[PDB]
Write an enzyme that holds these catalytic residues in place. Structure first.
Site, short mmCIF file in Angstrom:
data_model
loop_
_atom_site.label_atom_id
_atom_site.label_comp_id
_atom_site.label_asym_id
_atom_site.label_seq_id
_atom_site.Cartn_x
_atom_site.Cartn_y
_atom_site.Cartn_z
N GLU A 1 0.82 -1.21 0.00
CA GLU A 1 0.00 0.00 0.00
C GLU A 1 0.85 1.26 0.00
OE1 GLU A 1 -3.22 -0.25 -0.55
OE2 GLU A 1 -2.82 -2.40 -0.63
N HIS B 1 -15.72 -11.30 -10.62
CA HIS B 1 -15.36 -10.40 -11.71
C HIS B 1 -16.19 -10.62 -12.96
CE1 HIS B 1 -11.81 -10.36 -9.05
NE2 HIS B 1 -11.62 -9.14 -9.50
#
Ligand SMILES: *[C@@H]1O[C@H](CO)[C@@H](O[C@@H]2O[C@H](CO)[C@@H](O[C@@H]3O[C@H](CO)[C@@H](O)[C@H](O)[C@@H]3O)[C@H](O)[C@H]2NC(C)=O)[C@H](O)[C@H]1NC(C)=O
Ligand SMILES: *[C@@H]1O[C@H](CO)[C@@H](O[C@@H]2O[C@H](CO)[C@@H](O[C@@H]3O[C@H](CO)[C@@H](O)[C@H](O)[C@@H]3O)[C@H](O)[C@H]2NC(C)=O)[C@H](O)[C@H]1NC(C)=O
Ligand SMILES: *[C@@H]1O[C@H](CO)[C@@H](O[C@@H]2O[C@H](CO)[C@@H](O)[C@H](O)[C@H]2NC(C)=O)[C@H](O)[C@H]1NC(C)=O
Ligand code: NAG
Ligand code: NAG
Ligand code: NAG
Ligand code: NAG
EC number: 3.4.17.23
Lengths: 201, 596
Positions: B357, B487
């Site tokens: 991150e 997805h």
């Protein structure tokens, strides 16, 4: 001599409210003794960037009819206030001559000119027909025609409002938080000089 | 006056006023996601519905400029994003039907429930439970039952919705100057500007299998080894001629093989490198972890982290009634504001996630100087690859020893190195054929080569051929197996994950080459190397202003996408596998099935 006469820098540096850049405030100073030592030693001022006059020799020089122009701008645009500089506010809002002999002071004002909902009371000029001459002030608020048709003062296609507001917020990063800027101009014309620093005994 | 001047004035007017509205929407979303109250829901709704209700007019106005006369490229590229119809090409009825279809598909997927036969009143969900059952269990029969139940009580009603969805979206795409929806997805990988760096939509199709054919032997050898170990596992089920079943992979769909590590450990006796206990013993909190992560980037050469990130960001442990969803995210609220959000704990995976991150935040910070419409990666694959490079480079034993976690007199040998290489391979390289097959199936069905009747069967033999997965139980035409995926039911492109791995490994190999490192590639480290940081920054600062072909010219010396770094990384693993299974054979036969 004896006990001196002070010069009012308090009402130009410690004023509660400044003015937007497109209507930058101008003040004239004459017949006073100015002490720049207290301004130099102050630690609050971030930018103290002045070219034509050596900072340590302000008290020695003696001028007449000093000028002070004050406004509030964005953090990233402080570099635009310099001789021979280009940008958005340098050529459309406030232009300095190339032979400048002055001194520009800039400092952070995040905790004064910001609000949790946003401070939308600062505006700047964005569109102009042509550039701006040095030390020229324009407050005209007329619709701008970017095409080949009359606009008749209504925001139609290719007809924009020239002035746009600022979006100061308390959580914005450095470079977007408001900065307060004041420029001092030292002119020297043929009349006798009056404004210069104390003569220590 | 020329048209370009009018376009420049319009863009200058647009971006400044768009910035503030985007910032307000981002702030409302942050306040909602950090503090879940009823008020925040409608505040976010009413502070974000305005953003689209503003973007619509700006999109509408950016059509009177005839975008075939503009020059200067950058202006044309910036205007190209604005001149997007979106879904406005269709009338109100079709558009609202499509929106309702999307909403009902999402609701059906997100509220799945399957009850065991003996108790039709206590169901299980895709949340931990059924997922836990198929993740970390042992019984063959219960795994098969869970697989069939999930695929027969979720995706059976999705077939008509997806059938109507395909034709509706294809009609919209045809209305938007694209003959297929596959072209609409592939349009991201397209440039038609500077000569010598151009790239067409159809070239990616020819590129995907061209770069996939080179890694087939490695996948074949891994398949053979895993099949042999599973034959040492569950008896009288696997065949030494065919390919392994579907529900024994270790996941709902077989996307990742990480859960299969325990069964197929090479040595077993050798323990993996884990420093959680050492981190606890030194009294390490979240602040220490994030400061170490920042020091890594500072040592590399990237810019130092700004104030306010340590103040505004919710780094750790919300704790009391102040509830907050804390999927680890990196927020770029705009106007020079960057934040992170995570429920930090004292564990190695938290360390790696923090590094990932933080790399995301660094990349977001790099291109802040670009205009508003160009503040993204060159393509959709660069961002996650850049994020994962640091995670790859921060797990080396040398770096762990340098920060005083491992014992200073630690020595690595063949066994632990091979163990770590196998563990990383089972996650990285075992997913590429699945993604390739799924994307190929979606493109083929969008193009319409396979008709309505040839949907499931074709899917299944292409899965058997490309991947090597067989039927536990047959499905004829009444199921829609691919629809039961996150997805696929939520309308997300899936080819990003294929390019991400290749991009990340090319970047890592280039940095290691221009970092003066000697030895195997998998032990490379880029700490204390200013030249590598400068080389990386020279590409990160570009943003979307340049084509990704030019972006892949400052880090590496070739614009094309090659796959040699992957085969270079798993070289010791490949050379061990070559002499490991010298009796069993690679490859599988597509005719044998568990039930027939
Ligand atoms: C504008 O307002 C600022 C403060 O808001 C003024 O600066 C402050 O002036 C006072 C009064 O002289 C200073 O206090 C003095 O400090 C010295 C050194 O510690 C101490 O020996 C004295 O007994 C007295 O307490 C103060 O230091 C100074 N700075 C700050 C940050 O408060 C300023 O003079 C005003 N005018 C202008 C033109 O800036
Ligand atoms: C990247 O470079 C830094 C220095 O720029 C390396 O940090 C340095 O690491 C050495 C040992 O690897 C440290 O030396 C040791 O220091 C301790 C006291 O902390 C002392 O007791 C030992 O006898 C030994 O001298 C050095 O202090 C340390 N310096 C700093 C500023 O941290 C770092 O290890 C390098 N990272 C790599 C190569 O991955
Ligand atoms: C397209 O036009 C832009 C102007 O909006 C050019 O950007 C400037 O380019 C000059 C010279 O390359 C730089 O000195 C400036 O800093 C750039 N920015 C600005 C705001 O002026 C751009 O170079 C042009 N590109 C092409 C290919 O003509
Ligand atoms: C979260 O929102 C509630 C509702 O207004 C408020 O009372 C509470 O103070 C908020 N939390 C924080 C940390 O401000
Ligand atoms: C968007 O749709 C309109 C018709 O409603 C069409 O005239 C326009 O050309 C479309 N925009 C683009 C960029 O094609
Ligand atoms: C980077 O930021 C940290 C945070 O305080 C600071 O300690 C360090 O000196 C900085 N390094 C620089 C500015 O090179
Ligand atoms: C690793 O393999 C090499 C190759 O022969 C050998 O020389 C070395 O001793 C081995 N190391 C260990 C720890 O087995």
């Amino acid at each position: 001599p004896n006990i001196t006469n002070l010069c009012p820098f308090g009402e130009v540096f410690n004023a509660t409210r400044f003015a937007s850049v497109y209507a930058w405030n101008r003040k004239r100073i004459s017949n006073c003794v100015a002490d720049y030592s207290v301004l130099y030693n102050s630690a609050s001022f971030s930018t103290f960037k002045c070219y034509g006059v050596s900072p340590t020799k302000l008290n020695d020089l003696c001028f007449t009819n000093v000028y002070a122009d004050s406004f509030v701008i964005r953090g990233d645009e402080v570099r635009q206030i310099a001789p021979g500089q280009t940008g958005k506010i340098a050529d459309y809002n406030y232009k300095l001559p190339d032979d400048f002999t002055g001194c520009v002071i800039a400092w952070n004002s995040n905790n004064l000119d910001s609000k949790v909902g946003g401070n939308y009371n600062y505006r700047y000029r964005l569109f102009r027909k042509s550039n701006l001459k040095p030390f020229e002030r324009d407050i005209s608020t007329e619709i701008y025609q970017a095409g080949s048709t009359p606009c008749n003062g209504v925001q139609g296609f290719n007809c924009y409002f020239p002035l746009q507001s600022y979006g100061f917020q308390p959580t914005n990063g450095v470079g977007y938080q408001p900065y307060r800027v004041v420029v001092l101009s030292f002119e020297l014309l043929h009349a006798p000089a009056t404004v210069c620093g104390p003569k220590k005994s | 006056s020329t048209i370009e001047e009018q376009a420049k004035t319009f863009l200058d007017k647009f971006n400044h006023e768009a910035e503030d509205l985007f910032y307000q929407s981002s702030l409302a979303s942050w306040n909602y996601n950090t503090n879940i109250t009823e008020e925040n829901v409608q505040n976010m709704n009413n502070a974000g519905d305005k953003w689209s209700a503003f973007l619509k007019e700006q999109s509408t106005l950016a059509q009177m400029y005839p975008l075939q006369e503009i020059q200067n490229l950058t202006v044309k590229l910036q205007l190209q994003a604005l001149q997007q119809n979106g879904s406005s090409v269709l009338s109100e009825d079709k558009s609202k039907r499509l929106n309702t279809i999307l909403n009902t598909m999402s609701t059906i997927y997100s509220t799945g429930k399957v009850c065991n036969p003996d108790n039709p009143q206590e169901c299980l969900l895709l949340e931990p439970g059924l997922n836990e059952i198929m993740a970390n269990s042992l019984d063959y029969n219960e795994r098969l039952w869970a697989w069939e139940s999930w695929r027969s009580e979720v995706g059976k009603q999705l077939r008509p919705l997806y059938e109507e969805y395909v034709v509706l979206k294809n009609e919209m795409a045809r209305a938007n100057h694209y003959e297929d929806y596959g072209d609409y997805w592939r349009g991201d990988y397209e440039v038609n500007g500077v000569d010598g760096y151009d790239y067409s939509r159809g070239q990616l199709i020819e590129d995907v299998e061209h770069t996939f054919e080179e890694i087939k032997p490695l996948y074949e050898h891994l398949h053979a080894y895993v099949r042999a170990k599973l034959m040492n596992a569950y008896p009288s089920y696997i065949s030494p001629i065919g390919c392994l079943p579907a529900h024994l992979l270790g996941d709902m769909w077989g996307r990742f093989w990480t859960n299969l590590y325990s069964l197929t450990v090479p040595f077993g006796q050798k323990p993996n490198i884990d420093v959680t206990d050492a981190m606890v013993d030194q009294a390490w909190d979240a602040q220490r972890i994030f400061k170490e992560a920042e020091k890594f980037f500072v040592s590399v050469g990237l810019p130092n982290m700004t104030q306010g990130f340590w103040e505004n960001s919710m780094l750790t442990d919300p704790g009391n009634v102040q509830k907050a969803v804390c999927h680890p995210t990196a927020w770029d609220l705009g106007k020079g504001d960057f934040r992170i959000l995570m429920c930090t704990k004292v564990t190695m995976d938290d360390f790696l996630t923090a590094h990932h991150e933080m790399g995301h935040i660094q990349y977001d910070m790099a291109y802040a100087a670009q205009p508003f419409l160009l503040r993204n990666g060159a393509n959709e694959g660069f961002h996650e690859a850049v994020g994962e490079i640091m995670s790859l480079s921060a797990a080396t034993p040398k770096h762990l020893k340098s920060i005083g976690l491992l014992s200073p007199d630690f020595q690595e040998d063949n066994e632990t190195e091979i163990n770590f290489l196998l563990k990383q391979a089972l996650t990285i390289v075992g997913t590429l054929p699945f993604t390739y097959m799924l994307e190929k199936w979606r493109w083929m069905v969008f193009k319409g080569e396979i008709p309505k009747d040839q949907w499931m069967k074709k899917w299944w033999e292409m899965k058997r051929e490309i991947v090597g997965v067989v039927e536990p139980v047959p499905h004829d035409e009444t199921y829609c197996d691919p629809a039961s995926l996150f997805h696929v039911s939520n309308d997300y492109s899936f080819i990003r994950y294929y390019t991400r791995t290749l991009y990340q490994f090319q970047f890592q190999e280039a940095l290691c080459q221009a970092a003066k490192h000697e030895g195997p590639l998998h032990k490379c480290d880029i700490s204390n190397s200013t030249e590598a940081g400068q080389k990386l920054f020279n590409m990160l600062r570009l943003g979307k202003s340049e084509p990704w072909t030019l972006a892949l010219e400052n880090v590496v010396g070739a614009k094309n996408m090659n796959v040699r770094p992957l085969l270079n990384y798993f070289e010791p693993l490949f050379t061990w596998l070559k002499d490991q299974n010298k009796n069993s054979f690679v490859g599988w036969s597509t005719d044998w099935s568990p039930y027939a």
